[PDB]
Amino acid sequence: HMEPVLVVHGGGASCISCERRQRVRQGVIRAASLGHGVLRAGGSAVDAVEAAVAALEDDAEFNAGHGSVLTENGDVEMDASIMDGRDLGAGAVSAVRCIANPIKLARLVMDKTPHCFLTGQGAAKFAADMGISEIPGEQLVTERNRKRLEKERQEKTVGAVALDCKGNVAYATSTGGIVNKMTGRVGDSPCIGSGGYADNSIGAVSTTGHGESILKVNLARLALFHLEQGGKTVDEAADLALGYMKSRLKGLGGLILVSRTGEWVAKWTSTSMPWAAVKGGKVHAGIDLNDTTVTDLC
Amino acid sequence: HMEPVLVVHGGGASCISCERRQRVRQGVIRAASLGHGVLRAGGSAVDAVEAAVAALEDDAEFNAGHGSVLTENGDVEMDASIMDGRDLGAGAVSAVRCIANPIKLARLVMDKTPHCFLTGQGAAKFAADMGISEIPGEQLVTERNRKRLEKERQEKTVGAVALDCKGNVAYATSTGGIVNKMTGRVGDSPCIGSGGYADNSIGAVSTTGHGESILKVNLARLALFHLEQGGKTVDEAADLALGYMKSRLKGLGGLILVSRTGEWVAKWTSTSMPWAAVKGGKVHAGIDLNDTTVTDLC
Numbered sequence: 001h002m003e004p005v006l007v008v009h010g011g012g013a014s015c016i017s018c019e020r021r022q023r024v025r026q027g028v029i030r031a032a033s034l035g036h037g038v039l040r041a042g043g044s045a046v047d048a049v050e051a052a053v054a055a056l057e058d059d060a061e062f063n064a065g066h067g068s069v070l071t072e073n074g075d076v077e078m079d080a081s082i083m084d085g086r087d088l089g090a091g092a093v094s095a096v097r098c099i100a101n102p103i104k105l106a107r108l109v110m111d112k113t114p115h116c117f118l119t120g121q122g123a124a125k126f127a128a129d130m131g132i133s134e135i136p137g138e139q140l141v142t143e144r145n146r147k148r149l150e151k152e153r154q155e156k157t158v159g160a161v162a163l164d165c166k167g168n169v170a171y172a173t174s175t176g177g178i179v180n181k182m183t184g185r186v187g188d189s190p191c192i193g194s195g196g197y198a199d200n201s202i203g204a205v206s207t208t209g210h211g212e213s214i215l216k217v218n219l220a221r222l223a224l225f226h227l228e229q230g231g232k233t234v235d236e237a238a239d240l241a242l243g244y245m246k247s248r249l250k251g252l253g254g255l256i257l258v259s260r261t262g263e264w265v266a267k268w269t270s271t272s273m274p275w276a277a278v279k280g281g282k283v284h285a286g287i288d289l290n291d292t293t294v295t296d297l298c
Numbered sequence: 299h300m301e302p303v304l305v306v307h308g309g310g311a312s313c314i315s316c317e318r319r320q321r322v323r324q325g326v327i328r329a330a331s332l333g334h335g336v337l338r339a340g341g342s343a344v345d346a347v348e349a350a351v352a353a354l355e356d357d358a359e360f361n362a363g364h365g366s367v368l369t370e371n372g373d374v375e376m377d378a379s380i381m382d383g384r385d386l387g388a389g390a391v392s393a394v395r396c397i398a399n400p401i402k403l404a405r406l407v408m409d410k411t412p413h414c415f416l417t418g419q420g421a422a423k424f425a426a427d428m429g430i431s432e433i434p435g436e437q438l439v440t441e442r443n444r445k446r447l448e449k450e451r452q453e454k455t456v457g458a459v460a461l462d463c464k465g466n467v468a469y470a471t472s473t474g475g476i477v478n479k480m481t482g483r484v485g486d487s488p489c490i491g492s493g494g495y496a497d498n499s500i501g502a503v504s505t506t507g508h509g510e511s512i513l514k515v516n517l518a519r520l521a522l523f524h525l526e527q528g529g530k531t532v533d534e535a536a537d538l539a540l541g542y543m544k545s546r547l548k549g550l551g552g553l554i555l556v557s558r559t560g561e562w563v564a565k566w567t568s569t570s571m572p573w574a575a576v577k578g579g580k581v582h583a584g585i586d587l588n589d590t591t592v593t594d595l596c
């Protein structure tokens with residue numbers, strides 16, 4: 001009968017703008033609030049992370065769902081994955097077009113098919129089978145992302161992790177990818193062990209950053225490798241994982257980690273990663289390393 | 299200069315016939331000699347796994363390339379992945395249709411793009427960009443696989459590791475999937491850490507078996523985790539990884555492992571798994587526990 005925890009992240013970045021910045025803070029707080037409210041109410045770890053990531057999908061400030069970056073086609077292709085710590089259940093979708101909430105489709109892949117990963121037109125056909133509508137792809141496009149893709153041609157992720165009241169853990173990750181990706185490019189976010197991992201015997205991670213690197217070191221399984229070795233903190237394990245990515249590959253990013261026991265951290269190696277957690281009636285939140293707030297829950 | 303090594307596997311099942319069993323053994327032996335002849339000539343670990351995996355794709359007796367199993371729609375959809383132990387270079391393709399050699403596409407993903415993983419139509423557009431030609435899909439279909447699909451719709455993989463002369467390690471895995479899979483179903487094969495892993499600091503692995511289980515435990519990455527911990531032979535590291543997958547998930551499968559020092563093992567918890575290894579002047583081969591033969595290299 002354990003003390004619930006939920007942690008969310010809003011994606012490793014560089015400098016965040018002005019008006020944009022209070023609102024990003026506001027977003028993670030509201031998604032992690034919601035996911036925690038799911039847990040207080042007695043719902044599962046899996047329920048909480050889906051809810052949190054689904055709100056950060058619908059939120060246009062974040063690169064997942066609505067708000068997703070564009071491919072070299074000026075097109076939205078999204079990846080996402082969810083896992084259950086109890087029995088290792090998993091669900092994931094890659095290169096999905098015209099679906100407002102991939103994390104939901106992914107959880108449907110988990111509960112309703114004997115598989116863990118569907119891609120492209122097959123995940124589209126499945127969305128229909130599940131009774132999910134496609135939306136016009138223009139709906140997911142914000143004008144800021146057209147200018148990002150214009151620039152990236154001219155010149156030169158959200159997640160949550162939860163411990164529920166019965167002690168189960170789970171993670172969820174959802175992305176638009178990296179701006180100007182080739183068509184049908186798949187990052188780490190739909191990939192079990194890279195975009196996140198969940199196992200009740202250790203804990204749960206959700207990662208963000210340069211996807212190819214995350215893939216190559218199995219970043220999420222790696223934080224947990226370090227944590228399952230006996231005498232390390234979640235905070236240490238996070239940094240060793242992320243250290244190995246930076247130093248081995250020049251790969252920056254971040255993750256969020258919650259342990260079997262309720263411990264949690266949000267670490268990043270890139271310039272910033274908006275995050276928030278909820279535990280024991282307080283809500284924590286930050287973007288840079290030096291704006292951490294605490295505040296009594298609502 | 300290290301003594302080069304090369305192992306291949308032909309995937310594990312419930313049973314194999316007797317007319318096509320001598321022919322299965324011949325197949326893994328030939329792909330192994332082919333790949334190992336590349337290493338003897340000064341080709342890279344990566345050259346040799348592409349070459350052996352590509353031969354096995356072309357050998358119609360194996361569920362990869364020509365001879366790939368059928369999805370629910372009686373169609374062929376293929377996955378493959380390849381990895382460079384030296385810099386963690388990786389390349390992958392999922393849900394690939396009408397291409398003769400999915401492993402060679404995956405390698406062109408590694409060397410020719412800034413990405414690691416392409417899927418579906420994106421993989422296809424990348425193939426046309428590379429000069430590769432679609433084939434009609436009927437010619438990857440065997441009659442054996444038309445009848446499996448029906449046997450399953452009524453009632454109810456290949457890979458390689460190398461250590462080259464300069465001591466680089468690598469793997470390649472290619473499959474047609476599992477019979478009667480959902481369109482767009484992605485298995486462990488194109489997934490780094492699950493279908494295989496290669497890291498010069500440890501060794502390289504290629505897996506086969508229950509795809510969903512393989513991904514949930516990150517089976518290749520795990521084999522290698524035990525091995526990097528110390529106190530373990532390659533034999534033990536693979537018993538534990540596979541023993542865990544089976545104890546935690548009832549998932550059965552196999553792997554081929556080669557450590558950075560030249561020691562290799564082939565290991566399965568399925569009834570059988572075809573494999574061959576070449577090292578020095580001798581060729582090892584087998585399917586079941588009591589049928590390992592060691593013969594002078596030709």
Ligand SMILES: N[C@@H](CC(=O)O)C(=O)O
Pocket residue numbers: 011012157175176177178186187188189207208209210211212214253
């Ligand atoms: N991991 C994401 C990008 C990010 O984390 O911001 C991807 O490569 O698909």
Ligand SMILES: N[C@@H](CC(=O)O)C(=O)O
Pocket residue numbers: 309310377455473474475476484485486487505506507508509510512
């Ligand atoms: N691992 C393969 C199946 C096998 O190896 O037999 C897949 O599920 O895609």
Ligand code: NA
Pocket residue numbers: 056057058059060061062063064065066067068
């Ligand atoms: Na969003």
Ligand code: NA
Pocket residue numbers: 354355356357358359360361362363364365366
């Ligand atoms: Na074949």
